[PDB]
């Protein structure tokens, strides 16, 4: 598979630190981390141009994001809040192709 | 020998709003290491390429290290080495051409000194003293230790943030809790010299090009030289 977001599904109590990760197989530069959420399509929180380097989305804010390889990009909660609870979508691409993980759905209760 | 800076020759951490992860990268337990080695390639003139291997993780076998010019490249090109330096992948390149398009790859500046002559007896390693300044007042002092009489300033710089990322949080994820810091080295000669230790203003950061500056390969003499960190808090 292009794309694995690990866990698949999670649980999680306010103030916990929580890290989801996406592994790619494909060696593409770039990665990014975004989250679904009623009335909104999917917004980008951080993304990546390449190993050790991470870069702000359109609403970052409450999560730090870690690019130790090719393959890995991690997005952090650091203290979770309820209204982080969604479903968080990893993808990799080149191009104008983007190859989807199939989501985490996270509650932060 | 360059005049210390003042507050406007420095960078302001506040004026910087992209991510401080990016800075925090280059020096936090991050460093490419090799002893004893010989270059391979080449890919520009100014630079040399060596056979070395991740150790922590499997992000590279091969590294290009940028100097000043050809020269210097020619002064280490056939030369057995140690080097030490602060790596990074975005826009890293270099052809390997002979294909090999399937072997990681990480590029670097300077980081080289010659082996032989270079190193103590039996594993003993020198000191380094670092005195820490915070609102122009010593704050705590710290060692680094090298294995090597002349060492890069670049090698113990990174030493140097090492330690105080972890003691001080110099960088954090999204920003630092000091607005300037430079890192000043004196040499017993009377020479100093300094690097400004925050990312250029804006809201992008450009590893390769805040590296470049150890692209001179500047060597000091780890026995007798200083150190000093200034930092000002935000």
């Known amino acids: ?109 | 020998s360059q005049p210390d800076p003042m507050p406007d020759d420095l960078h302001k951490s506040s004026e910087f709003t992209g991510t401080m992860g990016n800075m925090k990268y280059l020096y936090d337990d991050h460093y490419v290491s090799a002893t004893k080695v010989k270059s391979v390639d080449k890919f520009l003139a100014h630079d040399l390429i060596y056979n070395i291997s991740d150790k922590k993780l499997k992000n590279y076998d091969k590294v290009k290290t940028e100097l000043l010019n050809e020269d210097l490249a020619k002064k280490y090109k056939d030369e057995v080495v140690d080097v030490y330096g602060s790596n990074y992948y975005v826009n890293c390149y270099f052809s390997s051409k002979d294909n090999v398009w399937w072997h990681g790859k990480t590029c670097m500046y300077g980081g080289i000194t010659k082996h032989e002559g270079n190193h103590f007896d039996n594993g003993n390693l020198q000191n380094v003293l670092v005195r820490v300044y915070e609102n122009k007042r010593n704050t705590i002092s710290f060692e680094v230790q090298t294995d090597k009489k002349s060492v890069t300033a670049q090698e113990l710089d990174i030493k140097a943030r090492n330690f105080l990322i972890n003691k001080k949080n110099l960088y954090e994820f999204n920003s630092s809790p000091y607005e300037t810091g430079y890192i000043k080295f004196i040499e017993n000669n009377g020479n100093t010299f300094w690097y400004d230790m925050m990312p250029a203003p804006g809201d992008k950061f450009d590893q390769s090009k805040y590296l470049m500056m150890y692209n001179d390969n500047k060597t000091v003499d780890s026995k007798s030289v200083k150190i000093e960190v200034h930092l000002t808090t935000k």
């Open chain 1, 1 to 109: 598979a292009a794309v694995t977001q690990s866990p698949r599904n999670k649980v999680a109590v306010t103030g916990e630190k929580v890290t989801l990760s996406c592994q790619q197989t494909n060696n593409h530069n770039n990665m990014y981390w975004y989250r679904q959420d009623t009335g909104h399509g999917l917004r980008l929180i951080h993304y990546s141009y390449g190993v050790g380097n991470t870069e702000k989305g359109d609403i970052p804010d409450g999560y730090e994001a870690s690019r130790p390889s090719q393959e890995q990009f991690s997005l952090i909660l650091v203290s979770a809040t309820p209204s982080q609870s969604s479903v968080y979508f990893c993808a990799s691409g080149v191009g104008g192709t983007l190859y989807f993980g199939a989501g985490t759905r996270l509650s932060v209760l």
